[PDB]
Design a protein around this nucleic acid. Structure first.
Lengths: 107, 241
DNA sequence: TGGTTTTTATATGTTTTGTTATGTATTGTTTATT
DNA sequence: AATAAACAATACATAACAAAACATATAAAAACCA
C-alpha cells in the first residue's frame, strides 16, 4: 500500500544473522543468545518506524466466542460456560450480568 | 531446472565437424532473470571455481610494429575458448559491445574489420549471463518479452533462459530460513557426509571421463517426438538448442 | 376548431479519443587516450 | 576502432484536458385525425 516499501528478502535475514553475530561479538561471547535477535529486529523495525511521525465482560465475551467458534450453539442451558467461568478466576454475579446483557443483545 | 541446466551445460554435449567446410558444437548459452537477492552470484562464482578457463566480466587483434606482425591480445571470452564464461548485469551492459556477443551466440567467431586488420577467428565457449528485469524485478501485469528490456532477435537466438523469480509465500521460505540456520545450529559442518551427495573430486573425475569418452549419436528414432515438441512453441534456434 | 400524437429544440450526461506541456531519462557530440 | 567523461539536445511517459461520438429528457412546435 501507500506507506509500503520493498519486501522481505533472504539477504535481510542474512543481515539480521550478521547483526546478531556482531552483537555477540561486541559482548565477546562464543555463542549467540536470544537477546541479540530481539535487539536486531527492533533496530530494523525502528529504522523505518520514523515515517509515522479493564476487560470486565470482554474476557467472558472471548470465552463465549471461543465456545461459539468450536460448536456454535446459542442455547439456554449453560453447563460448560459456567464451569469455565468458575475456573477462569472471576465471580458468577458478573457472569449472570453478562448473560443478561448478551441475551438483551441477543447473541 | 537451473541446476540441471548448468550441470548439462558443463557436461557440454557433442562437437562434430566436417572435413573441410563445416563445424558444430554441442553448446548452450544461458541467461538468468527474475527476482533478485538469491543464489545468482553464488552460481556465477561457483562455476568460476569449477572450470579451468573463464573470466568474470572479447579480445582484439593488433598489428605489433616491433615484429611487424598481427598478434592477438586478450582475456575474457577469448581466453576461455574452452569452458564457460560468466557475465553479470546483462541489462546494464552497453549496446556497442552487444554486437560481439551476437556473433558468439551460435556462430562462435570474432570478425574484426578495423585499421590494420580484417580477420575472422575462432572464439567458442559458452556464456552464463545473469540479468535483471529493468527496474521491475518482474511484473505479472506485463509480458516476459518487455519486462527484461532485452531485444527479441538476440533472445530468440539464446539457447536457454531461466525465470528464477521467487514469488514469496508460506511453507517454502520457512524451509529456506531453516536450512540457512541449520548450519548455524552447529559451529562446524562435520555432519555433511551422511546424505546422498557426491564429493567434488569424484564429480569432476566422472565429468572429465564422460566429456572425453562419449560421442553420442542422435538417431532417427527420436524424430517423431521432436517435431511435435517444436510445433508447440510454433503454434530453428530452439530446435538447435 | 380540438384533442392527441409526433417531432424538434434545448439541455445535460457518458465514454472514447486525441492533443499538449513538462520533468526526467536517454542519446548524441566532442575531446583525450588506448 | 574502442573507451571514458562532461555536456547539450532530444525523446518519452504521463498528467490534464478538450472535444467529438454516443445517449437521454422534456417543454414547445407541428402535424394530424376527427
Amino acid at each position: 500500500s501507500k506507506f509500503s516499501f520493498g519486501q522481505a528478502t533472504p539477504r535481510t535475514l542474512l543481515g539480521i544473522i550478521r547483526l546478531s553475530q556482531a552483537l555477540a561479538k561486541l559482548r565477546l561471547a562464543d555463542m549467540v543468545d536470544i537477546d541479540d535477535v530481539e535487539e536486531a529486529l527492533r533496530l530494523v523495525r525502528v529504522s523505518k518506524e520514523s515515517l509515522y511521525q479493564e476487560s470486565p465482560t470482554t474476557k467472558i465475551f472471548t470465552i463465549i466466542k471461543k465456545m461459539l467458534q468450536e460448536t456454535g450453539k446459542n442455547t439456554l442451558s449453560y453447563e460448560n460456560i459456567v464451569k469455565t467461568v468458575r475456573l477462569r478466576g472471576f465471580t458468577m454475579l458478573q457472569l449472570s450480568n453478562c448473560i443478561q446483557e448478551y441475551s438483551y443483545l441477543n447473541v | 531446472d537451473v541446476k540441471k541446466g548448468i550441470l548439462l551445460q558443463l557436461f557440454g554435449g557433442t562437437n562434430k565437424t566436417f572435413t573441410k567446410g563445416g563445424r558444430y558444437r554441442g553448446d548452450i548459452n544461458i541467461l538468468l532473470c527474475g527476482d533478485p537477492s538469491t543464489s545468482k552470484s553464488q552460481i556465477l562464482q561457483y562455476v568460476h571455481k569449477i572450470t579451468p578457463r573463464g573470466v568474470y566480466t572479447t579480445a582484439y587483434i593488433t598489428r605489433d610494429v616491433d615484429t611487424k606482425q598481427l598478434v592477438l591480445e586478450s582475456g575474457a571470452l577469448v581466453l576461455s575458448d574452452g569452458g564457460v564464461c560468466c557475465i553479470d548485469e546483462f541489462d546494464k551492459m552497453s549496446d556497442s559491445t552487444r554486437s560481439v556477443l551476437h556473433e558468439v551466440m551460435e556462430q562462435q567467431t570474432i570478425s574484426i574489420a578495423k585499421a590494420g586488420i580484417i580477420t575472422t577467428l575462432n572464439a567458442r565457449s559458452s556464456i552464463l549471463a545473469s540479468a535483471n528485469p529493468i527496474g521491475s524485478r518482474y511484473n505479472p501485469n506485463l509480458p516476459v518479452t518487455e519486462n527484461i528490456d532485452l531485444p527479441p532477435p538476440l533472445l530468440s537466438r539464446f539457447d536457454l533462459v531461466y525465470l528464477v523469480l521467487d514469488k514469496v509465500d508460506e511453507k517454502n521460505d520457512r524451509e529456506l530460513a531453516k536450512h540457512l540456520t541449520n548450519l548455524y545450529l552447529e559451529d562446524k559442518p562435520e555432519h555433511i557426509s551422511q546424505d546422498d551427495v557426491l564429493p567434488v573430486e569424484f564429480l569432476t573425475m566422472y565429468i572429465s571421463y564422460a566429456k572425453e569418452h562419449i560421442h553420442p549419436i542422435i538417431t532417427e528414432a527420436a524424430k517423431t517426438e521432436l517435431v511435435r515438441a517444436y510445433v508447440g512453441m510454433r503454434k530453428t534456434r530452439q530446435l538447435e538448442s
